[PDB]
Symmetry: C2
Subunit: 238 residues, 2 copies
């Protein structure tokens, strides 16, 4: 259930630690189960990682080894690295499972959790309108009569609005019977009622605010935001 290869983590985690020592022009380590024991190297990896200067104690002594690791554990704790169950004794007395654990937790912190930090940074280059438009388009990708590219004229014919509710709630009505209703005005009241009565959505709009040469962008946007607030919300980002 794990396929936790301790022999493989020994190598790749050493390659990872060495690739960072490389980035900071620092000596490489060769054995992960004993080269992290005195605490000096953990402090150096933490220097390139953090930016701080981490004075290291002398020691040939266990005592210094332990000071050196406690300081690295405090630096790590300030950086919010998971450390549950990893003490300095464990690193100084060479517990290979917890030494691999510590290195995994530093890798998760500074590399694996960047996936999520880059996504959040991606949200930030983005506004709500664009997230909403992507949600409408993904929701309506299997409805060929619909092609949404704006919050104005893509909605006059009444299809996009019905397709969007339909894509989330196929249970509420039949796609083709909206498609053969030639009246746009009638596709619209249909969707507004399904949205008011099946979904609880207040009718901000009248068919003439949508079915018109110059529909109002803000009112449609606002209305479609109401649908988004109560339907599933899978969107694309970055």
């Amino acid at each position: 259930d794990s396929y936790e290869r301790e022999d493989v983590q020994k190598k790749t985690f050493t390659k990872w630690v060495n690739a960072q020592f490389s980035k900071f022009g620092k000596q490489h380590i060769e054995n992960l189960f004993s080269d992290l024991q005195d605490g000096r190297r953990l402090l150096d990896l933490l220097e390139g990682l953090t930016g701080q200067k981490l004075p290291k104690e002398k020691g040939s002594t266990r005592v210094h080894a332990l000071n050196n690791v406690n300081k690295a554990l405090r630096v790590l704790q300030n950086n919010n690295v998971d450390l549950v169950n990893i003490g300095s004794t464990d690193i100084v007395d060479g517990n290979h499972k917890l030494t691999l654990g510590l290195i995994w937790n530093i890798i998760l912190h500074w590399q694996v959790k960047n996936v999520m930090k880059n996504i959040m940074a991606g949200l930030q280059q983005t506004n709500s309108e664009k997230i909403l438009l992507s949600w409408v388009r993904q929701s309506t990708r299997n409805y060929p009569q619909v092609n949404v590219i704006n919050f104005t004229t893509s909605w006059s014919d009444g299809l996009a609005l019905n397709a969007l509710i339909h894509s989330h709630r196929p249970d509420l009505f039949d796609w083709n019977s909206v498609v053969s209703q030639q009246s746009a005005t009638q596709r619209l009241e249909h969707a507004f009622n399904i949205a008011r009565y099946q979904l609880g959505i207040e009718k901000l709009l009248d068919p003439e605010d949508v079915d018109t040469t110059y529909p109002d962008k803000k009112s449609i946007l606002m209305y479609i935001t109401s649908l988004f607030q109560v339907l599933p919300q899978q969107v694309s980002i970055e």
Copy 2:
């Protein structure tokens, strides 16, 4: 270029304001261009919105009208609603453009910007592994020989790794010539080199850490995170 229908915003923004008075069991307004003039109603909408008690001044007087609007502008400013160019004189002297603007800015704050707040709340039910897996799968959707469902055994044959680089950089090599290379071990070194030499990616992995009955999840995860860090990052959320 706008298709800014002031006649439509007058109605839908009144429907929006009334729908909130409804949610807080408050009186409806009927004319948006004069019913917001003394400041009392803006304070009531702000009560349901904010949770606060917004004492309102008496006044039949412009003076009180203005106090009433200044207090609502301060409440709004504390809530980070855009107010550039909207003063209380504008609301009290009935400037329909700025009254519509104020109401649009409150709607954007408390409704339209929930799209982006719900996405960020969605990231929070999610970890990096799952965002990465979705990115691999979306990146490799047009590569039929590839089907990624884990960070272990879906990568042993060497295809998924090559497909993922290929989907972002079709320029670097030829898909079919990786597909006809029967040696998995050889598809892997191929990808690691393309990643090391065309992409700058450090070879954390050896073909035997991947091409093996029990590949190590963490090492692959870590390695694939390196690719994600330098390739385009479109993912699916919520």
